[PDB]
Amino acid sequence: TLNGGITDMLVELANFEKNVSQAIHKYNAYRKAASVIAKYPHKIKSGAEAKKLPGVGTKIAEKIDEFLATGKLRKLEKIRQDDTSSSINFLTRVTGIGPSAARKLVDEGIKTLEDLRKNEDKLNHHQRIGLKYFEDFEKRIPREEMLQMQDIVLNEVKKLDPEYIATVCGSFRRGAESSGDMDVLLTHPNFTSESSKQPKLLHRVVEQLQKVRFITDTLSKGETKFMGVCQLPSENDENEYPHRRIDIRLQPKDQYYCGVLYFTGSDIFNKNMRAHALEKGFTINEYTIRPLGVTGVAGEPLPVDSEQDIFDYIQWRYREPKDRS
């Protein structure tokens, strides 16, 4: 280009006056300056040459002049900041606050982490702890620490009851050098899809994990899923281990490996695996795999005793989790 940087700036400016301002006659103005400058066959070197062109006003020349000196524009910086549909996506980075809540805070004035902490009365318990450990929850968890966390969790589970099965899933299970959090899939032969719902099989693990000081906060304690906060034991060291997000999911025995498969995923891998079951005439859920007919009529859930059965069913060779990108 000769003037791309100017027209880019100008069009973005224009779309603000139509989207956000609904001041449509400044849209039309900014557009005019884009078209002419875009048709002007020389490289603009300052704002006054533009002001000549029958569409670049003083204020636009006033705008263009800034862009060619710094390499940026102050007007567009704060507009990119104050976007309602981008400030909503930063508030959702706090656990507990979905877009539902994120909408509820932004147009009421609160849109920043400082302003979130300027009005804690407007946010529930889950959201408050999420807001408190926010920076910690930003951090990655090195594999080293994941391996330690796994030790604690898996040792406590086995001690409680040999019949419990616990698998740490997610990118960790795919052998990733770092993780965002920990997600434990847990089952017990007393809990099946036909059986009567058994919240204490989950409760007992969570409580033991609190007893040994690994679990430090509860965000969400359900009947089949726990969401909370956890922390490695230190001794006493400058900035000890940061607080980590942990989830524990209790699944029915007969639906467990479908769960492990799903939660170990990779998103992309799960999609590709599901499309493929579908090509072979099977449907895969995080709970079951079933024959699928002609129409979307699904049949009876097939027996799964391992991740391997599911691969067998859809005619794939087993994939190591490490190879599930």
Curated annotation (Swiss-Prot):
Alphabetical list of InterPro entries matching this protein: DNA-dir_DNA_pol_X, DNA_pol-X_BS, DNA_pol_b-like_N, DNA_pol_B_palm_palm, DNA_pol_lambd_fingers_domain, DNA_pol_lamdba_lyase_dom_sf, DNA_Pol_thumb_sf, DNA_pol_X
A GO term, aspect molecular function: 5'-deoxyribose-5-phosphate lyase activity
Superkingdom to which the source organism belongs: Eukaryota
Chain residues that bind Mg(2+) 2: 181, 183, 247
Enzyme nomenclature, EC number: 2.7.7.7, 4.2.99.-, 4.2.99.18
Cofactor(s) listed: Mg(2+)
Reactions catalysed, as given in the entry: DNA(n) + a 2'-deoxyribonucleoside 5'-triphosphate = DNA(n+1) + diphosphate; a 5'-end 2'-deoxyribose-2'-deoxyribonucleotide-DNA = (2E,4S)-4-hydroxypenten-2-al-5-phosphate + a 5'-end 5'-phospho-2'-deoxyribonucleoside-DNA + H(+); 2'-deoxyribonucleotide-(2'-deoxyribose 5'-phosphate)-2'-deoxyribonucleotide-DNA = a 3'-end 2'-deoxyribonucleotide-(2,3-dehydro-2,3-deoxyribose 5'-phosphate)-DNA + a 5'-end 5'-phospho-2'-deoxyribonucleoside-DNA + H(+)
Protein location: Nucleus; Cytoplasm
Domain remark in the UniProt entry: Residues 239-252 form a flexible loop which appears to affect the polymerase fidelity.
Family designation: Belongs to the DNA polymerase type-X family.
Name of protein: DNA polymerase beta
The species this protein was found in: Rattus norvegicus
